[PDB]
Amino acid sequence: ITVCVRKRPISRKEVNRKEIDVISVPRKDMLIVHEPRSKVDLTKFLENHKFRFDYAFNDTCDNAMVYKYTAKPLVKTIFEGGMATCFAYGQTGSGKTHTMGGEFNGKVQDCKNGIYAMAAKDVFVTLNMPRYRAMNLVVSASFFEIYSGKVFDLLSDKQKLRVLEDGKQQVQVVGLTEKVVDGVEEVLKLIQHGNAARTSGQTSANSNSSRSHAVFQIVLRPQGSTKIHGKFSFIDLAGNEINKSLLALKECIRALGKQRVSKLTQVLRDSFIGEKSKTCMIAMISPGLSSCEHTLNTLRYADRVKELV
């Protein structure tokens, strides 16, 4: 389990608003929140809180840089035959969609730019390497979203899927469509398709929205194996049913170290249970002073998750 935090820079709208930048990342693993506060007498003072993470990324850091530290180290895990998960967690507008899906203040744009794409790129390169080539693996991808306890196939026009659990308690999402990909270009097509289809409200003036949980997965399969050779699930979480899933998620990840159900944790459950499984959590933070309450909430959540480490 690795937990990181990434601060996004203040946007033009916030800047114009003259929002104050409350966060500083003086070191590679140190994040500081300069919380503004007022005493009862309304004296102004700053309570600077410090948080440490495996990796803390500044506003300057690009998606490639973030990807290098978080997801990239997980790819090998799938080739190893494990199950890896990477979660983007944070408040609305914190940058989760931007990081996973691609660069866009709308959270929707260039697929190539995001972690799903970058991860895919590495998957093809590694498969090609000598240690792996013997494996004769096929790469498959799927993209679905979870909304109000319901699973929808982004690859198959929001088709509602049913999720069942055996006595064995292994979960399966029936009807989920897996698409064969043999090129990064292929994966980019599927990402574009899924992202367009993603849930939301009316066309907002700007930005996307995270009413749902987005999960794009990369699966490796020889002919089954452990029900497939390896699987990487990249999840674009909804802004911090949602609460229950987040609570559920925390316990599952912490359970990962040692070894109040939700749909997300149910679908993901096989990814937590196995011995050979790794996860990375990236906490997104919006630097604005107005968002200070949200950020502390995000950071504290993050602390507990890493605690399991």
């Binding site: 069942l164 659990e165 055996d166 006595g167 029936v174």
Partner: protein, 426 residues
Amino acid sequence: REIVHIQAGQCGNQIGAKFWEVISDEHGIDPTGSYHGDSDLQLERINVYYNEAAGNKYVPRAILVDLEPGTMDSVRSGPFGQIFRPDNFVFGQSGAGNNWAKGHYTEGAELVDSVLDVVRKESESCDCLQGFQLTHSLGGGTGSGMGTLLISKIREEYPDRIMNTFSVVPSPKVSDTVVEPYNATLSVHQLVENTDETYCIDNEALYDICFRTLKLTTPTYGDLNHLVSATMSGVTTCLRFPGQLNADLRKLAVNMVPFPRLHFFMPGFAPLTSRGSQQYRALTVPELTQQMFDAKNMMAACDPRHGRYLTVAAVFRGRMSMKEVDEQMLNVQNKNSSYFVEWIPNNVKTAVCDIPPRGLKMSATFIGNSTAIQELFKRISEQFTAMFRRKAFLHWYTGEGMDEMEFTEAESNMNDLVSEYQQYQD
């Protein structure tokens, strides 16, 4: 406020006839007649179960869902049978096969849309909707399957209005069907995840309570049904009456469900004395709590004495002292501190209507949320496995377009449901 009853399956239907047989008299509504009400209070709140059209014809606002004509054609060809507007009868002349799968995926799934249609015509009736009453048996097709679907749809259409469910969980000793645990385990599954108040009744918990608590020697079904319908009247309709301290479905719900599962209760009536003799009138009140809180007298199969309670709701309905009521409840809570769970300082939810059951002086419906009902889903769940293991009469399900993972699902789910419930017994 309002509600719209739902008679799923034959049983749930047969009972409809008894629930409405009663309720009507508890509201002075003759077959097609109007309000003959001995009083004037049995009318200011009727709406909860009827609709205004003619001016003497207040028609029950329920639904009659069933894939076996003969049934509804027995309920519609007998006594009060001619009060339901025909529009209410959502029949399925198909083969009402005794398969959960045949009334939930293949046969019932068709008749559903023609039901929801009406469940909307009734919901959009008028004023404000509260919830829907659901009667059925978890041991058949039109009951567990098709009725368990009716709700899964209802709860998607109005995740706001409540959902009380009256289930006739498969009695132990003898099963009035063979696949029973199949049709059951599969319906409880749907219940633990849609309705938010379930009142489980046991045909044999009734017999007992009806053959020893009513020296009644020939307890016909009509009776059992009648007794049950007696409780569901105390619950709903009742609270839709005045009271020093009145509640309503929600209060009942918001005071009885500590954890979202939905949890199932076990109803118990108060004055349950044999006709002539017994008419002891020992009904001052300590006599009602004496009753309600004993083992026998719990329409459920399991015995409370076998597991703590989380919540209790003595919904009394007959002039009494908010003192001799509020008081009794206490001693009761202390004489049995043992089984009554502790992390709830006051498990009991005292409720108090005014007007009592038409001909009686004082009654009190009991709605218990005890952890004892663990020892029932256990039962059911057992029967499943013992037969699932060999896929017994499974071909009648799969062959109807089912899944080998569907049965797995339910059992587990409902099986876990047993687990949780213990998390409080401790």
